[PDB]
Amino acid sequence: DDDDKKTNWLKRIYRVRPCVKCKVAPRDWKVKNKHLRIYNMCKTCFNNSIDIGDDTYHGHVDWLMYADS
Amino acid sequence: DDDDKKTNWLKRIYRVRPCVKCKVAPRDWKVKNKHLRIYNMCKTCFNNSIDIGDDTYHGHVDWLMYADS
Ligand SMILES: Nc1ncnc2c1ncn2[C@@H]1O[C@H](COP(=O)(O)OP(=O)(O)OP(=O)(O)O)[C@@H](O)[C@H]1O
Ligand SMILES: Nc1ncnc2c1ncn2[C@@H]1O[C@H](COP(=O)(O)OP(=O)(O)OP(=O)(O)O)[C@@H](O)[C@H]1O
Ligand SMILES: [Cl-]
Ligand SMILES: [Zn+2]
Ligand SMILES: [Zn+2]
């Protein structure tokens, strides 16, 4: 089923690329309508980036959650 | 740059999962507005599926080509 191909891919993408900052924890994310937003950092590193004044790693990638647009 | 994270991922996704039918050739695809449609089969297997009367492998997965929805 093509929706399952998309879901399996999103599980893999989320699993295999951890937080860009600590390189260990999984990334924060949210659901944004029909999209999954995967932020670049875990929550702990993101909150810390605000404290330390670094926006270098801020950002996200949005993924359509379904196989058909 | 977050758009590059998306583009690099789409290159990887396209590369690592060949045609679901012959298991060798890369899949057919097209650009569908702001989406990349990756069909399940290469063109040769898709055309052949029409000739042989099998719709089992018909289908596709659409991917947003940009990091921000
Ligand atoms: N965990 C995180 N890691 C990296 N960047 C993040 C993280 N959380 C938020 N950001 C950055 O913070 C900014 C705000 O994100 P957010 O998803 O809240 O945007 P939005 O579209 O304004 O949604 P809303 O206004 O409803 O919160 C974006 O630059 C986003 O990439
Ligand atoms: N190479 C292929 N492998 C598997 N399935 C395919 C392939 N090419 C087309 N299909 C299937 O054929 C059908 C038509 O696809 P297509 O992308 O042409 O749809 P569409 O949204 O009707 O666009 P248009 O009407 O502009 O052609 C869909 O079920 C699609 O998955
Ligand atoms: Cl996507
Ligand atoms: Zn982290
Ligand atoms: Zn094939």
Residue numbers in the entry:
A (entry chain A), B (entry chain A): 5 to 73
Provide the publication's sentences verbatim:
DNA sequencing of the output from this selection revealed a distant clone (clone 18-19) that differed from the consensus sequence at 15 out of 80 positions and bound ATP with far greater affinity and specificity than all other clones from that round of selection. The fold is characterized by an α-helix (residues 6–20), followed by an extended loop, then two short β-strands (residues 33–36 and 39–43), followed by a second α-helix (residues 46–56) that leads to another extended loop which terminates in a third β-strand (residues 64–68). A zinc metal ion is bound by tetrahedral coordination to four invariant cysteine residues at positions 23, 26, 46, and 49.
Protein DX is the double-mutant protein isolated by optimizing protein 18-19 for improved folding stability. We determined the X-ray crystal structures of protein 18-19 and the evolutionarily optimized variant, protein DX, to resolution limits of 2.8 Å and 1.65 Å, respectively. The structure for protein DX was initially solved by molecular replacement using the coordinates from protein 18-19, and later solved independently using single anomalous dispersion techniques. The Cα backbone trace of proteins 18-19 and DX can be superimposed with a root mean square deviation (r.m.s.d.) of 0.51 Å from residues 7 to 71. From this comparison, we found that protein DX exhibits significantly greater thermal stability than protein 18-19 (79.5°C versus 57.5°C, respectively). The Asp32 and Val65 amino acid mutations identified during the evolutionary optimization of protein 18-19 are located on opposite sides and faces of the β-sheet. The largest structural change occurs as a result of the D65V mutation, which eliminates the R21-D65 salt bridge, causing a significant repositioning of the Arg21 side chain. By comparison, the Asn→Asp mutation at position 32 does not alter the protein backbone, but instead results in an ion pair between Asp32 and adjacent Lys47, that is critical to balancing the dense positive charge present in the ATP ligand binding site. Indeed a slight repositioning of the Lys47 sidechain toward the purine nucleobase can be seen in the crystal structure of protein DX. The results from these experiments revealed that mutations N32D and D65V, located at solvent exposed positions, significantly enhance protein expression, solubility, thermal stability, and ligand binding affinity.
